[PDB]
Amino acid sequence: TPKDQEIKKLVDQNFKPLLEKYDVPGMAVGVIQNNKKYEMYYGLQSVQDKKAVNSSTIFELGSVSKLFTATAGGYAKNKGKISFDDTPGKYWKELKNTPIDQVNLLQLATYTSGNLALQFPDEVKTDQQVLTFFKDWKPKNSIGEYRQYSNPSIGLFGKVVALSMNKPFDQVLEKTIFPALGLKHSYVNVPKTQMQNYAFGYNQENQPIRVNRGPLDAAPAYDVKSTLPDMLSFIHANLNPQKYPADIQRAINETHQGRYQVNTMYQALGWEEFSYPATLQTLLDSNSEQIVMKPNKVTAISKEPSVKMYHKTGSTNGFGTYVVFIPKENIGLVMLTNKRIPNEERIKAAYAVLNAIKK
Numbered sequence: 164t165p166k167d168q169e170i171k172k173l174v175d176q177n178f179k180p181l182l183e184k185y186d187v188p189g190m191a192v193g194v195i196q197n198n199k200k201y202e203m204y205y206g207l208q209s210v211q212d213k214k215a216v217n218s219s220t221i222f223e224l225g226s227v228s229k230l231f232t233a234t235a236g237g238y239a240k241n242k243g244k245i246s247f248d249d250t251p252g253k254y255w256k257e258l259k260n261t262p263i264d265q266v267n268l269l270q271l272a273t274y275t276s277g278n279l280a281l282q283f284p285d286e287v288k289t290d291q292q293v294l295t296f297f298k299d300w301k302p303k304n305s306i307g308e309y310r311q312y313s314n315p316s317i318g319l320f321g322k323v324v325a326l327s328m329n330k331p332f333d334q335v336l337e338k339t340i341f342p343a344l345g346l347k348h349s350y351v352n353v354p355k356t357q358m359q360n361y362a363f364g365y366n367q368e369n370q371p372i373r374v375n376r377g378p379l380d381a382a383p384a385y386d387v388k389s390t391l392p393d394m395l396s397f398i399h400a401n402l403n404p405q406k407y408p409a410d411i412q413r414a415i416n417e418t419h420q421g422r423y424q425v426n427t428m429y430q431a432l433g434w435e436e437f438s439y440p441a442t443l444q445t446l447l448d449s450n451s452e453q454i455v456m457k458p459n460k461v462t463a464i465s466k467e468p469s470v471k472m473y474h475k476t477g478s479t480n481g482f483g484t485y486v487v488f489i490p491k492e493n494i495g496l497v498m499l500t501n502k503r504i505p506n507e508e509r510i511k512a513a514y515a516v517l518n519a520i521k522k
């Protein structure tokens with residue numbers, strides 16, 4: 164198809180060179196435009212097995228997992244199972260009357276507790292250790308005022324969401340959220356029947372690796388795996404939520420609302436949000452060291468931008484992910500690799516493709 168061939172050309176021009184540049188064994192790049200999916204596959208999901216990347220290949224999403232946690236949270240909130248003004252001790256009773264019970268669920272979900280780093284301490288592994296960490300937590304910066312991107316922060320949010328739904332978090336996603344979104348091969352735990360389709364990731368020494376699940380935040384913050392067709396369906400759902408049943412529709416819409424702004428970036432639930440059209444530099448700035456690694460003072464939303472776009476990067480030690488969608492253009496893109504590549508490359512290559520696709 165001439166449309167199939169234009170898109171393959173653009174991905175070859177912009178994403179294929181990254182394979183040689185970063186020694187990436189395998190890659191899936193998907194574009195959805197006007198409800199039509201385009202899937203492009205490169206290389207091998209397993210080097211040792213000579214198994215090609217294909218429509219069945221399961222990749223680790225890294226921090227793109229946070230988008231499913233955000234959707235789960237929007238689901239629970241719109242079903243009245245939680246309120247974003249609630250605090251965690253309302254649901255995790257051992258946290259009642261501890262300092263972290265001053266932080267509300269929205270602030271946990273959007274990284275503004277004022278004292279949570281990117282990762283749990285190395286020694287925090289068991290469920291009791293996680294509970295002790297949260298009971299012993301004390302505030303630092305003014306609660307709600309400083310965004311510091313944080314796995315334990317959204318992990319606590321995910322734990323509370325799971326408690327409010329009386330299901331373990333993995334079951335919230337696999338039994339409720341994934342099916343509502345129409346996903347068929349998205350997992351927290353890849354079943355034995357699917358291990359043949361689970362790619363190996365690759366470190367810089369080209370050794371095959373897969374994500375090590377640590378404590379209670381692995382699932383909500385970085386432990387989801389999925390396929391290119393599933394991620395395209397997830398972008399389709401975000402582009403056309405009005406096409407989905409009410410429960411998951413409200414959940415999706417909840418993840419599209421800016422909650423505060425930091426420079427040119429609006430922090431939504433999970434998604435990063437930008438006024439559209441957004442410059443490349445704006446999209447690049449959202450993944451700067453300053454934004455990702457350090458605390459930054461937030462500003463309340465004066466007026467939500469009327470035309471928006473959204474993205475999120477994600478990595479594990481062995482995998483890279485990038486997802487982006489633009490409602491006004493009914494277009495979105497997914498990139499999955501089984502080796503990390505710099506976030507700036509993901510964003511630049513996606514930007515070139517999306518801005519070059521004809522109407």
Ligand SMILES: *[B]([O])([O])[C]([C]N1[C]=C(C([O])=O)N=N1)[N]C(=O)[C]SC1=NN=C([N])S1
Pocket residue numbers: 225226227314373374375376385476477478479480481503
């Ligand atoms: B998320 O992707 O933002 C988040 C933090 N992160 C990691 C990187 C990277 O590797 O370049 N960029 N942002 N991802 C995680 O925390 C993943 S945690 C683990 N990944 N593999 C493991 N075995 S544990």
